[PDB]
Amino acid sequence: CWLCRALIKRIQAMIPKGGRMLPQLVCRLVLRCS
Known part of the structure; x- marks a missing residue:
């Protein structure tokens, strides 16, 4: 009676992101x- 530990690790993979060059x-x- 657990498994839910799998949905949590998922969020773990979606935490990425950044961007921002400003050239x-x-x-x-x-x-x-002139």
Whole structure:
């Protein structure tokens, strides 16, 4: 009478995630024109 321990380890595999590069430098940083 347990098994539920399997659903829990599942959440364990779904905890991943991140992202976030933010490459706006050259965009508004250059605008040399000259």
